[PDB]
Amino acid sequence: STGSATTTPIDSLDDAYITPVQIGTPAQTLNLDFDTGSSDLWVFSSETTASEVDGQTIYTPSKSTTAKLLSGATWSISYGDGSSSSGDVYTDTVSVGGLTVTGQAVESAKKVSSSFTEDSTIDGLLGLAFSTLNTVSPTQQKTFFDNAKASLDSPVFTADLGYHAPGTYNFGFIDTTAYTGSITYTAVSTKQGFWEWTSTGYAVGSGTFKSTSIDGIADTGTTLLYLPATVVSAYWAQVSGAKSSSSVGGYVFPCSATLPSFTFGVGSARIVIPGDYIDFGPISTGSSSCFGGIQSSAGIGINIFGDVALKAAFVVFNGATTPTLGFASK
Ligand SMILES: O=C(O)[C@H](O)c1cccc(Cl)c1
C-alpha cells in the first residue's frame, strides 16, 4: 500500500504545516502537524477542556463506531518549545492520503497548553519519530508509520515541504518526479528516538564550504534551523546589522536586508537553503527588525534541522531495519 497527502503551511511564514488526517468511522477529518521529532498522535477532542479549545476541529470518539477506549492508558508530552498536552487514549481507524491503519492509538487531549489553544489551525500532532519516544503509559504505543510499515510497498515516508506553498507527505514510495538529481543517503542513529544524522558541514552564501560534522535531527515539527553558535554566528556576520537579541530571543536582522543562502552538507552532496527561506518577518507587527530563520541550538542540547532546512530538500525517512535519511535537491 501507499499514501499521499498534501501538507499546507498554516500561515504566510510557514510557521508550521498541516496535513488532513481521517480518524474514525464515519471519517472525522482533522488537520494535524506531522512531526518527525515526536511520536504521539494526539488530537483536540470532545474531551479537551472547553476553555482550551479556540477554533480547532475536535475528534469526538463517541461518534466513531470504530473508536475503542484504550482502558487505563494516559499520555503526557512536553515539546522543545515549552508547549505541552495530555489526556487519555482511544484506538481507531486512521487514514492519511488513502493509507489506512486500523487500531491506531489516537491520543485524546484533556489538556493543552496555551500555544496549542492559540493556534486555531492545528488540530493535533501526528508523530513520525521512533515509537520509543511515545508517551503512552503504561503501555507504549506505535506511531502511524510503524503501524503502517509492514503494509507499505517500501518502509519509507517522504517529506516534501513547500516554501510559502503546499507540499507533500508520501508513505510507502519515493516519487522520482519530486526531486532533481539523485538522493543522497546518510546514516541515522535511533539512540535518542529521533531521525538523528550527521551533516558534513556548511557554507554561507557563496563562501567556501566548511567541512565539519554537525549532529542533529530531521524534525518537521520544528520551524527553524538550529545549529551550533559558531555556525550561526558565521551566518549572521554576513548580514549587515544582524545581531543576537536576548530580549527578542535570538538573531534579528534589518528587514531591509537581502539574506544570503545557507548550504548544509549531506555526505558529499549539498543542500542550498535560499536566503528568503531564512526570513521570518517583523518581530512584531510593523517592526523593521526581522526574525532570523537560523538560530543557535546552544541551550537546546541538540541541533535541529527544522522546516527551514527540510523545505529546501526532498527528504526520505527510510524506516528499513537499519534506518537512514535521504536528501535530494528539488
Ligand atoms: O529596525 C531598525 O532599527 C533597522 O531595521 C535595524 C538596524 C540594525 C539592526 C536591526 Cl535588527 C534592525
Integer Cα distance of 126 and 117 in angstroms: 17
Total Cβ atoms within 10 A of residue 130: 23
Q: Does the CA dihedral 103-104-106-107 come out positive or negative?
A: positive
Using alpha carbons, select from 92, 144, 101, 113 the residue that is nearest to residue 44.
113
Pairing type for strands 124-127 and 279-282 reads: unpaired
Q: What is the resolution of this structure in A?
A: 1.6
| Cβ 293 vs Cβ 304: under 8 Å | no
Residue minimizing CA distance to atom 7 of ligand 1:
254
Whether 146 is catalytic is: no
Pairing type for strands 294-296 and 225-227 reads: parallel
Cell numbers placing 234: 558565521
Residue type, 241: G
Residue minimizing CA distance to atom 6 of ligand 1:
254
Closest atom of ligand 1 to 256 CA is 5
CA dihedral 177, 34, 165, 44 (to 10 degrees): 140
Integer Cα distance of 55 and 18 in angstroms: 15
Q: Domain limits of the chain? A: 5-174, 175-330
Cell numbers placing 297: 541550538
Pairing type for strands 124-127 and 28-35 reads: parallel
- Look at the chain and count its residues: 330
Total Cβ atoms within 10 A of residue 55: 11
- The string over 288-309, giving b where at least 16 C-beta atoms fall within 10 Å of a residue's C-beta and e elsewhere, is ebbbbbbbbbeeeeebbbbbbb
| Cβ 280 vs Cβ 292: under 8 Å | yes
237 burial via Cβ count (<10 Å: 0-12, 13-18, 19+) = exposed
- The string over 192-214, giving b where at least 16 C-beta atoms fall within 10 Å of a residue's C-beta and e elsewhere, is ebbbbbbbbebbbeeeeebeeeb
5-174 and 175-330, same CATH topology: yes
SS (H, E, C) 124-144: EEEECCCHHHCCCECCCCCCH
Cβ–ligand 1 distance for 247 under 6 Å, the answer: no
Experimental method: X-ray
Integer Cα distance of 175 and 315 in angstroms: 11
Integer Cα distance of 327 and 158 in angstroms: 10
Bridge partners of 77, per DSSP, are: 85
Cβ–ligand 1 distance for 254 under 6 Å, the answer: yes
Structurally, what CATH architecture does the domain formed by 175-330 represent?
Answer: Beta Barrel (2.40)
Closest atom of ligand 1 to 245 CA is 11
Structurally, what CATH architecture does the domain formed by 5-174 represent?
Answer: Beta Barrel (2.40)
